[PDB]
Amino acid sequence: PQRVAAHITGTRGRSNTKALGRKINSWESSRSGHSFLSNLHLRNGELVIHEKGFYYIYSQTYFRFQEEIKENTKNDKQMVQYIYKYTSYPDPILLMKSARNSCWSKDAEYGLYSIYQGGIFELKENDRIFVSVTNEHLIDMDHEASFFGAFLVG
Amino acid sequence: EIVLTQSPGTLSLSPGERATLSCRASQGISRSYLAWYQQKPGQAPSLLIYGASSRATGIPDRFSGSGSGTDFTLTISRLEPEDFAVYYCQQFGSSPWTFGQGTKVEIKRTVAAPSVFIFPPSDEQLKSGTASVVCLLNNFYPREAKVQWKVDNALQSGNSQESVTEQDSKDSTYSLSSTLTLSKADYEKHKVYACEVTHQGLSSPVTKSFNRGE
Amino acid sequence: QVQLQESGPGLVKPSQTLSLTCTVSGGSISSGDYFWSWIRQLPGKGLEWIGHIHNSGTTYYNPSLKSRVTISVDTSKKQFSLRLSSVTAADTAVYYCARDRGGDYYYGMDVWGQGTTVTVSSASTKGPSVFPLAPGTAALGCLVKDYFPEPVTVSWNSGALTSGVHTFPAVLQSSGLYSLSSVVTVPSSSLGTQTYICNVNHKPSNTKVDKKVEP
């Protein structure tokens, strides 16, 4: 209960049965998608840091799509997820990045590309951290499919 | 937000000819979640097609819907003159539910010239404040028209503002409305007021004037 | 059959709270089905979906409208109401209420109200001044002038004459109030028989006045 952790998710429900990319800011709160915040707060999709320390930050971001051949389209897709942090400095700082390309075969009908990445970084008080993607319109936000988290690792 | 993009902005087509309206979503979306609306001038929209490709109750078979993923198409086959409204797609995909800018179908007719008219600022209007000379242009065809006002044989600037209708859903035709605003004090001096109407559906500019109730 | 009435003030004051209400005739809201809904339309361009509500009182809002928005039902009172907040210029627009068949099999709005045009200012509502414009086939029609806010209706011989009527979109004068003309064209050999009264109405100001147009 006196613990520093957080795992916020894609709103939009659940399945069947100077900074590159664009920031994801449609993440939201209280255990229903099964999110939570705990000694951290939110600020337009940026987690804000109370306790200065080492934090294992992570996010998965799912890319789902179908595709066609068109008159003026190159089909190559660069799916990159960025995890930046805003510090006391004017311009954001990229912390981690993970990328993938789509298949090339003109025979592709669809694309399923989920991207997990994470790692510990030392953050200070009031450091703000956010996820950021390319091909945003391709990101599926079913709530298990894409999320964003961090914890303190004392 | 999911963005719909209707192509094109406007279409001109004579009756009988065939109309293809496009609606393309920034992300692919169900199909159950795409609907089409028609909005006749000065009306609330009304539901044409629901579920990418279902006709709402009452809609004539002339209308059709197709598509999936990101590319959706509405097709009006053999145009009636009624069918010349504005057409919107909306997506209940995710959320805000959104609409496309809209595609405006405009009728194609056959040049008809305007029946020009001119109204003297009624006595009652004058009795307090100002004087309004109102020039009408009737059932025409096409979009363009020019309107000049002449006072003691001098051209005007700024002292007027006009308004057009949309094409008639029964007919096919526009109608303009230029008004002349100048005080019932500055009005009492000058003697001859003229409304000049230049049109491509005319041989030469037809004028309508009056001599302050003489 | 099932019909909807846009009840509510045509005026609201900069950063005061706008409000409207929708009424339901023939069949009732209650019935675990549809979503009762508010759509606005932003000066001659895109419609914007505001939010909807269910008969169980649960809502849904367009995020970007960063809750200024609230909306509610009363089945005992047969009406649902929207209320913006804190409004400005970017809130001036016609506001339709409408019934969407949530998935009670369509998805889409089968029933609309006619929608009231709301203007946001601290302005003072003015009543319209009516002066007739006096007259083959002739042209006659009255000039409705100097009002505010912008919703004005004008018919002829109270709905009995609709033939050849051309009521032209209102022009926002440099004064700040609006003008608007309303011509008719009739057989020139009728300037004497079953002749012509135009009835200008203006709800925001309580105006409802007729006027006879004659030689």
Next chain:
Amino acid sequence: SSPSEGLCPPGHHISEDGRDCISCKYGQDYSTHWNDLLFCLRCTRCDSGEVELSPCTTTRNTVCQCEEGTFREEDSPEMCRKCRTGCPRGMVKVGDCTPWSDIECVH
């Protein structure tokens, strides 16, 4: 209503203090079997290339089915896959294309 065995029924869901039943928002979340959930389970909205076959109520989740001409197999429940049109040579077709199966060609 009030609890019944420490359970709230479908459509409803329990409170923090553990004492009261609260009711899932309509076409937003749900609960179908009797529960002790502090939160209602969120509603599905048909991913693309599917059709909504029934709306998400309060005691049933929305139902999605593959588009017409696409199928959904047990081991590929993530994208609806296009039904084949032809069979190979020396192979003959018995069993049309359904929402849950490809076409079925034999020899």
